[PDB]
Design a binder for this molecule. Structure first.
Ligand SMILES: *C(=C)C1=C(C)[C@@H](Cc2[nH]c(/C=C3N=C(/C=C4\NC(=O)[C@H](C)[C@H]4CC)C(C)=C\3CCC(=O)O)c(CCC(=O)O)c2C)NC1=O
Ligand SMILES: C=CC1=C(C)[C@@H](Cc2[nH]c(/C=C3N=C(/C=C4\NC(=O)[C@H](C)[C@H]4CC)C(C)=C\3CCC(=O)O)c(CCC(=O)O)c2C)NC1=O
Ligand SMILES: C=CC1=C(C)[C@@H](Cc2[nH]c(/C=C3N=C(/C=C4\NC(=O)[C@H](C)[C@H]4CC)C(C)=C\3CCC(=O)O)c(CCC(=O)O)c2C)NC1=O
Ligand SMILES: C=CC1=C(C)[C@@H](Cc2[nH]c(/C=C3N=C(/C=C4\NC(=O)[C@H](C)[C@H]4CC)C(C)=C\3CCC(=O)O)c(CCC(=O)O)c2C)NC1=O
Ligand SMILES: C=CC1=C(C)[C@@H](Cc2[nH]c(/C=C3N=C(/C=C4\NC(=O)[C@H](C)[C@H]4CC)C(C)=C\3CCC(=O)O)c(CCC(=O)O)c2C)NC1=O
Ligand SMILES: C=CC1=C(C)[C@@H](Cc2[nH]c(/C=C3N=C(/C=C4\NC(=O)[C@H](C)[C@H]4CC)C(C)=C\3CCC(=O)O)c(CCC(=O)O)c2C)NC1=O
Ligand SMILES: C=CC1=C(C)[C@@H](Cc2[nH]c(/C=C3N=C(/C=C4\NC(=O)[C@H](C)[C@H]4CC)C(C)=C\3CCC(=O)O)c(CCC(=O)O)c2C)NC1=O
Ligand SMILES: C=CC1=C(C)[C@@H](Cc2[nH]c(/C=C3N=C(/C=C4\NC(=O)[C@H](C)[C@H]4CC)C(C)=C\3CCC(=O)O)c(CCC(=O)O)c2C)NC1=O
Ligand SMILES: C=CC1=C(C)[C@@H](Cc2[nH]c(/C=C3N=C(/C=C4\NC(=O)[C@H](C)[C@H]4CC)C(C)=C\3CCC(=O)O)c(CCC(=O)O)c2C)NC1=O
Ligand SMILES: C=CC1=C(C)[C@@H](Cc2[nH]c(/C=C3N=C(/C=C4\NC(=O)[C@H](C)[C@H]4CC)C(C)=C\3CCC(=O)O)c(CCC(=O)O)c2C)NC1=O
Ligand SMILES: C=CC1=C(C)[C@@H](Cc2[nH]c(/C=C3N=C(/C=C4\NC(=O)[C@H](C)[C@H]4CC)C(C)=C\3CCC(=O)O)c(CCC(=O)O)c2C)NC1=O
Ligand SMILES: C=CC1=C(C)[C@@H](Cc2[nH]c(/C=C3N=C(/C=C4\NC(=O)[C@H](C)[C@H]4CC)C(C)=C\3CCC(=O)O)c(CCC(=O)O)c2C)NC1=O
Ligand SMILES: C=CC1=C(C)[C@@H](Cc2[nH]c(/C=C3N=C(/C=C4\NC(=O)[C@H](C)[C@H]4CC)C(C)=C\3CCC(=O)O)c(CCC(=O)O)c2C)NC1=O
Ligand SMILES: CCC1=C(C)/C(=C/C2=NC(=C\c3[nH]c(/C=C4\NC(=O)[C@H](C)[C@H]4CC)c(C)c3CCC(=O)O)/C(CCC(=O)O)=C2C)NC1=O
Lengths: 162, 248, 96, 177, 164, 146, 164, 177
């Protein structure tokens, strides 16, 4: 788990020393950055099922062949659409976890570790999830550092997908 | 307002045929004949007194209120004559607590239960300012009495279906017992004394005892206690494609 | 973390003022001091208030006092020591 | 409800016994002080409002938390109610004193009062204090011992009646405890 | 009219029964005590113009502000009105001393006195001051016998309690 | 500001303090004699001396607070959790509040020099602001316990 | 019988040693809590037929299917023995309120009850529902004191957890 | 087996000195808070069967592979054994809450429970979910925040006992982790 707290502890333990002022400043940065990230977590929680449905619709509008081609990997049937909405909800949940936690600790543990194995075996293209994340970045309706903090965890997932 | 059990699980209410004869050019109302008037008075006694087992030595004093009633068919004035008699005051006021008398009036003359503490306070102030007859006159000449019973029917415990508050329904069932249940079981000590002033509700079993026949009464009781916990802050969640969201 | 440090100490400030009409004589001093409990002085107020309560007739009915059961002492059968023991015998109240 | 004459009648009815000359010691003595009881009851009811207004103010005097926000006697609405209840307790103890029997107190007034106060959140100790002050005032007026309020009476002892009314106030105090 | 007879016959009417001896016993109670009760009848009747003024001037002395501009006693004939308005209460205590109960007072002077004394801004403390003046202005041996003074005062402090 | 009115007000209290305390507790007994009845908690010899000591400690602190012109030391030292200690021992709080009000009446009698048992020699002026201040200070200790 | 005395003399007898200070220290608490549990037991003893009647109909109100033929509550002989068994359980609860422990319950009502109720086709949920109804109709001020209600509901929960 | 009182004995016997003064604050606060402790252990003990059944049903209804054919709570024998394992642990946590020290929980329940579940093939992490559900029930039953049943307590604050039983439960969950 990559937090600003645990990396400061890992740097103090690597020297085997006590917590210097370096670690205390690194923790203080988390504390006066957290006030906007907790607002971003509240706001992404409130707009969740609207954003998931809109992101799934945006993926279907950008790639219409996913609703037409037969096969298990596509959302041509009903269970495929249910699993697509489940995956978009998974991505939004990891983004909110990284927001409240304060780093890319949850989604490194839960989403990107061994991600392309699944996309290669299950044959699911990462460009679909990129298109969903671009909609979520464009349509969350935030302002200021709340927007700067939510977008910064969105394009980390975009950068790992690309 | 549907009364899912008013006129199908319960009989129809009893009273005078209709109010058009009250317009009175040659008579005040169709002579219901003396044999459909003695059952009307028997019905009124069973209501305003509420099965008090009144002997005829004690029915030799209600002769004057009766004798005007069969002559001039207003029911409301008949009960106004009854509730001011010594037969009424001896039975419910003489040896009872105050809110006991006040709550028994809601059962007898209005057929419902007191919906709040402020109603009881208003009755208390209205009693203190000069008599109990003012209490009965306020109830009888009330709006609620006009738009429930009127001058035609006996006042009965009507299942409204569309109650202004639910505790009104609970407290209607607790005052109204079963048949062969009277109003001198407790020696005073009204049943809603605590629950009115506190705001909690009543026993589930004693409400279920007063329900009509064939209403699946009493069932559906989880085996842990019945009164809900105000302190509790449970977390209820919904279902989202991505996860479960809790609203606070 | 929450206890008053001096709640069980009975320590109170003593104030002493000196004034003799001249400005060179005026002086105030304040020092903390433990307040002691006088064993002897409470007895007089206790006895006098008990006598006052014993003579008041309207407090006798509005404040009906409680019976106190006597201490256990063995009976010996003879009534001269049962009803008039030497701890009490021949005591009688002066009224002045 | 019952009175002093209806006390002995129901006591003797439990034995199916006639009320003979042996039991009329008590009632005929009850009739002896009949004028005394009447001389006492108007003395009490003659100061009814002042006694209550003094009683609740005395209540408040050593319990200033009742005025405070959240106090049971904070707003005037609450005060108005608590000032009534003085009239009701006092009226019922006057009824009981007049009848010579407390058979009207705990059926009519004190029946179910403790639960009513518990549901409403009325503090018991302060109410007991209010009743006590009223009790003290009761005896002061019966015995013509009030500091002011000189009332003309006939000379004698009303101490028995004082103890009677004190016993009646006692019941009220113990009923809500 | 709250009287000793009107209580018992109204009770009998409510119970729908004939007058029993328990009812007749109360009228016997009247038979004894009218003589004491009506002895004060002359005393109020023939002496009433003296008590009113002794009372009204005491009222105005105890509250001198009431003559100030904007108060109740701001001109002359309002003061005359005040004296009339206590004369009415003396008349009513005489009526009540005659009937035996508080019948006349609580329906002719007390019933509704609240509305008039607030909307016309008349302080009730001024009424009770004047009435309490006459309550202790009485000396029992000289004025009446012993028991007329008790019952006159018992009627006076009735309305004292009712107003206050 | 001015001390010659303040120091006179303190000196009019700290001189006759023991009589104020002994009169306050005897008046508190004088209303209800249940505390000296066997079973009351002023009945024994050890208890009424402790009650005298507590009354004097309360008077000590309020006399210091009148000198200081503030009540912060009064609520730091004395009233820091006194009521629940009286509950845990078991103390009739109404009677101690009554004794506090008796001491409050005696203090404002002594400050105004309107005491009708003893007379101080003073200068000419009005000390009613100090009387209201010490009345507020007595209300602090009267409200801090209940 | 499982109680306060018997546990500590059985422990001292198993160890083979005299009663020490801890044993007597355990009896001081029996002296303390007997003031609450005995006046719980007395109030249960004085009004038991009302409670057994009140809790008996909650069983058939919750489970109305027992009065059907083929079930265990067909005729009046079954309902009378139902009320008798509920009265037995309330008597054992009164006994445990007196002895201070769960001895009379554990040996006269609980041990062996499962084989009887399974063999004789008696549903345990309805033997439980009466005890559950009895617990919820308790107000400490109205029915008993505050600690008496705790002492009563603890044995009721013990019986409920034993039969469930 | 050590309670709160014996813990200071073993701590000061390593010191070799008499214990008084400094070490008595915790013991006198433990005594002064003892009614809340008994009041809390009674509330946990009165609701034991509903707690165990609700915890195991919640663990199954979150992870339905346990009642799957071949799961660890599949047959009736395994389900009865899980209910027994469930609350065997509740019994020992109640012992540790009554004693005020978790030494009885270490010696008789957790000493070797880690590899006992390993040798049995018991999934050691659904047991953690059942333990956490029992913990969440215990804190709500102590603090009277239970939504299904409300109990009768004297008013006051006892979140120290709730944090102590939460401190016992995560220890009982981490011993098998
Ligand atoms: C608060 C600290 C406080 C008060 C407020 C005030 C209230 C109070 N008064 C008494 C004592 C009496 N009250 C009396 C009543 C009246 N006197 C009258 O002249 C009229 C008729 C009537 C009402 C105004 C009387 C006569 C007394 C003297 C004692 C007595 O009983 O005669 C008390 C003490 C209560 C008691 O024990 O009697 C209280 C609390 N006093 C305050 O201290
Ligand atoms: C308060 C005063 C008071 C009264 C005086 C009576 C008056 C009275 N009488 C009757 C009703 C009656 N009154 C009589 C009486 C008589 N017929 C005769 O021929 C005789 C002259 C007389 C008897 C001596 C009869 C016979 C009837 C009923 C007749 C019938 O309709 O069958 C009724 C109708 C009441 C009813 O039944 O609804 C009334 C009000 N009632 C009162 O409340
Ligand atoms: C026949 C006998 C009889 C009584 C004794 C009273 C008892 C009584 N008091 C109140 C109602 C009340 N009673 C009080 C009284 C007090 N609160 C205090 O803290 C003091 C101890 C005390 C005054 C001295 C108050 C303050 C309320 C209303 C409080 C509120 O809800 O705002 C109510 C509720 C009635 C209602 O408003 O619906 C009743 C029944 N009424 C009766 O009919
Ligand atoms: C209808 C209203 C009505 C009343 C108010 C009373 C009025 C009243 N009181 C007494 C008479 C009395 N009243 C008292 C009472 C007292 N004397 C004292 O000095 C004590 C202070 C006080 C005690 C309460 C005594 C002692 C007598 C004389 C004894 C007696 O008559 O029994 C008497 C008979 C003798 C007399 O006239 O005085 C009467 C008529 N009776 C009534 O019918
Ligand atoms: C049968 C019973 C009966 C009564 C008691 C009176 C009551 C009464 N008094 C006044 C009217 C008045 N009453 C007073 C009296 C007083 N002013 C004060 O401040 C003191 C309280 C008091 C001094 C004695 C005054 C000054 C007026 C004139 C004020 C006005 O009329 O607006 C009025 C208004 C109409 C009028 O009379 O002009 C009435 C109804 N009337 C009745 O029929
Ligand atoms: C109908 C009711 C009624 C009253 C209440 C009194 C009130 C009253 N007192 C006095 C007048 C008087 N009243 C008294 C009497 C007394 N003064 C005292 O100091 C003693 C307390 C008291 C003993 C009884 C005296 C001494 C006078 C003359 C001085 C004065 O005006 O007070 C007067 C003037 C005419 C008269 O003397 O009577 C009146 C009306 N008179 C009444 O007609
Ligand atoms: C070191 C100890 C010390 C004291 C004890 C006081 C004593 C004191 N007070 C005042 C002087 C005074 N003292 C008072 C006080 C009062 N006058 C009253 O009428 C009230 C009853 C009472 C208020 C409680 C007043 C009003 C003055 C005059 C104004 C002033 O100098 O403050 C003076 C100057 C003139 C004089 O001697 O009177 C002195 C020395 N001052 C001190 O320095
Ligand atoms: C620093 C500030 C400070 C205080 C305010 C007092 C407060 C106080 N009083 C007592 C202790 C006591 N306090 C009282 C006093 C009273 N009980 C009554 O019934 C009366 C109402 C009242 C006296 C007027 C009594 C009687 C005891 C002894 C209680 C006992 O018997 O154990 C104790 C316990 C320790 C002790 O005994 O001293 C304390 C802390 N002490 C302090 O150190
Ligand atoms: C048996 C019942 C009994 C009582 C109820 C009290 C009586 C008592 N006296 C005073 C009242 C007082 N107490 C004092 C105190 C004193 N006066 C001095 O001159 C001394 C220096 C000091 C100790 C004697 C003072 C100065 C007053 C006010 C008197 C005045 O106004 O001058 C007070 C306080 C205010 C009041 O209520 O009046 C009380 C309660 N004593 C009792 O025994
Ligand atoms: C001293 C401890 C003690 C007890 C606790 C009881 C326990 C007990 N109850 C029953 C027996 C019973 N218990 C019930 C009760 C019920 N069945 C129903 O249909 C409803 C579910 C419920 C009603 C409340 C019935 C009907 C029987 C009789 C079973 C039968 O004879 O078929 C029996 C069988 C013997 C008999 O009673 O005839 C026993 C031993 N008896 C004891 O001696
Ligand atoms: C002897 C056997 C024994 C028991 C059966 C229990 C019963 C019990 N509980 C409390 C008393 C109490 N119990 C609690 C505990 C709580 N209150 C709450 O509001 C919370 C829900 C919960 C803690 C989280 C509190 C706060 C008190 C008040 C007294 C205190 O704080 O110690 C008391 C002491 C006061 C009283 O008598 O009521 C007793 C005997 N305790 C025992 O000692
Ligand atoms: C003194 C402390 C003490 C304990 C804690 C238990 C620990 C324990 N549990 C089991 C045995 C078991 N424990 C479980 C429990 C579970 N398996 C699951 O899948 C769930 C996570 C969980 C229930 C909530 C099961 C299912 C078995 C039986 C395994 C089997 O039958 O093969 C056994 C083997 C003996 C047996 O029961 O057959 C032991 C020693 N016993 C003790 O004596
Ligand atoms: C899908 C399967 C499934 C279940 C079986 C239930 C199981 C369940 N119950 C509770 C939560 C709880 N469970 C209880 C226990 C009880 N409550 C009562 O009313 C009874 C007296 C007693 C036995 C039922 C309590 C007291 C709480 C918390 C507070 C409350 O509800 O009042 C929790 C939350 C635990 C936590 O926060 O982690 C869960 C998962 N819920 C589920 O989702
Ligand atoms: C930890 C977070 C997490 C992620 C990211 C995740 C992805 C994930 N998506 C899967 C399948 C899938 N994902 C999709 C989703 C889509 N396909 C489309 O055509 C749409 C365009 C798109 C929806 C927007 C579909 C249809 C399947 C089923 C494919 C199959 O079963 O072959 C599977 C195969 C297992 C299964 O059948 O569920 C995994 C593991 N699972 C996780 O647990």
């Amino acid at each position: 788990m990559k937090t600003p707290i645990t990396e400061a502890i890992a740097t103090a333990d690597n020297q085997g020393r006590f917590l210097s002022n370096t670690e205390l400043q690194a923790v203080n940065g988390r504390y006066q950055r957290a006030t906007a990230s907790l607002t971003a977590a509240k706001a992404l929680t409130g707009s969740a099922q609207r954003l998931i449905t809109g992101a799934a619709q945006a993926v279907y509008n950008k790639f219409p062949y996913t609703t037409q081609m037969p096969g298990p990997a596509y959302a041509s049937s009903a269970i495929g659409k249910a699993k697509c909405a489940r995956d978009i909800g998974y991505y939004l949940r990891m983004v909110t976890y990284c927001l409240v936690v304060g780093g890319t600790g949850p989604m490194d543990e839960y989403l990107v570790a061994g991600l392309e194995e699944i996309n290669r075996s299950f044959d699911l293209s990462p460009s679909w999830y990129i298109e969903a994340l671009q909609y979520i970045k464009n349509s969350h309706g935030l302002s200021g550092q709340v927007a700067n903090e939510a977008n910064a965890y969105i394009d980390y997932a975009i950068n790992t997908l690309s | 307002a549907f009364s899912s059990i008013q006129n199908v699980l319960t009989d129809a209410p009893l009273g005078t045929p209709s109010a058009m004869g009250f317009l009175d050019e040659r008579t005040e109302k169709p002579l219901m004949g003396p044999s459909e008037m003695d059952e009307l008075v028997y019905a009124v006694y069973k209501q305003v007194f509420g099965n008090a087992h009144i002997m005829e030595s004690e029915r030799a004093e209600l002769r004057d209120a009766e004798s005007l009633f069969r002559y001039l068919r207003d029911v409301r004035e008949f009960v106004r004559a009854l509730a001011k008699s010594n037969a009424y005051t001896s039975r419910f006021l003489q040896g009872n607590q105050q809110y006991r008398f006040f709550e028994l009036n809601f059962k007898h003359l209005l057929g419902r239960g007191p919906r709040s503490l402020e109603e009881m306070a208003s009755h208390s102030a209205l009693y203190a300012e000069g008599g109990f007859e003012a209490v009965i006159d306020a109830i009888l000449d009330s709006d609620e009495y006009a738009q429930e019973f009127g001058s035609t029917v006996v006042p009965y415990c009507r299942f409204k279906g569309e109650y202004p508050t639910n505790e009104e329904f609970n407290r209607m069932l607790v005052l109204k017992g079963a048949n062969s249940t009277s109003d001198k079981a407790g020696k005073g000590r009204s049943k809603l004394c605590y629950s009115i002033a506190a705001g909690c509700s009543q026993n589930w079993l004693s409400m279920s005892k007063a329900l009509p026949f064939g209403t699946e009464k009493g069932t559906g009781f989880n085996l842990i206690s019945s009164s809900r916990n105000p302190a509790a802050r449970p977390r209820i969640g919904t279902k989202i494609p991505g996860g479960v969201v809790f609203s606070s | 973390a929450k206890k008053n440090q001096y709640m069980g100490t009975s320590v109170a400030p003593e104030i002493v003022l000196t004034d003799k009409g001249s400005d060179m004589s005026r002086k105030v001093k304040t020092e903390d001091k433990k307040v002691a409990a006088d064993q002897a002085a409470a007895m007089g107020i206790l006895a006098n208030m008990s006598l006052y309560a014993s003579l008041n007739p309207v407090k006798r009915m509005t404040y009906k006092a409680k019976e106190q059961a006597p201490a256990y002492v063995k009976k010996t059968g003879n009534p001269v020591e049962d009803f008039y023991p030497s701890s009490w015998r021949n005591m009688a109240p002066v009224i002045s | 409800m019952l009175d002093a004459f209806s006390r002995v009648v129901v006591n003797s009815d439990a034995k199916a016994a006639y009320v003979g000359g042996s039991d009329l010691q008590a009632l005929k003595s009850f009739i002896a002080d009949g004028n005394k009881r009447l001389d006492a009851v108007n003395s009490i009811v003659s100061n009814a409002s002042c006694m209550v207004s003094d009683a609740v103010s005395g209540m408040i005097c050593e319990n200033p938390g009742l005025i405070s926000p959240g106090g049971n006697c904070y707003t005037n609405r609450r005060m108005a109610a608590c000032l009534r209840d003085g009239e009701i307790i006092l009226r019922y103890v006057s009824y009981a004193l007049l009848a010579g029997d407390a058979s009207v107190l705990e059926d009519r007034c004190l029946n179910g009062l403790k639960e009513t106060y518990i549901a409403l959140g009325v503090p018991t100790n302060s109410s007991i204090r209010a009743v006590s002050i009223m009790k003290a005032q009761a005896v002061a007026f019966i015995t013509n011992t009030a500091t002011e309020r000189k009332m003309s009476f006939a000379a004698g002892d009303c101490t028995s009646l004082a103890s009677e009314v004190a016993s009646y106030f006692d019941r009220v105090g113990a009923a809500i405890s | 009219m709250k009287s000793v007879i009107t209580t018992v016959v109204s009770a009998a009417d409510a119970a729908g029964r004939f007058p029993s001896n328990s009812d007749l016993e109360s009228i016997q109670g009247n038979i004894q005590r009218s003589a004491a009760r009506l002895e004060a009848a002359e005393k109020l009747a023939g002496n009433h113009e003296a008590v009113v003024k002794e009372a009204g001037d005491a009222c105005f002395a105890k509250y001198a502000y009431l003559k100030n501009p904007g108060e109740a006693g701001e001109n002359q004939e309002k003061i005359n009105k005040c004296y009339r308005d206590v004369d009415h209460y003396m008349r009513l205590v005489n009526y009540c001393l005659v009937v035996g109960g508080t019948g006349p007072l609580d329906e002719w002077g007390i019933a509704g006195a609240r509305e008039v004394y607030r909307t016309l801004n008349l302080p009730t403390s001024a009424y009770v001051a004047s009435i309490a003046y006459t309550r202790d202005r009485l000396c029992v041996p000289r004025d009446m016998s012993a028991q007329a003074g008790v019952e006159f005062s018992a009627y006076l402090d009735y309305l004292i309690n009712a107003l206050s």
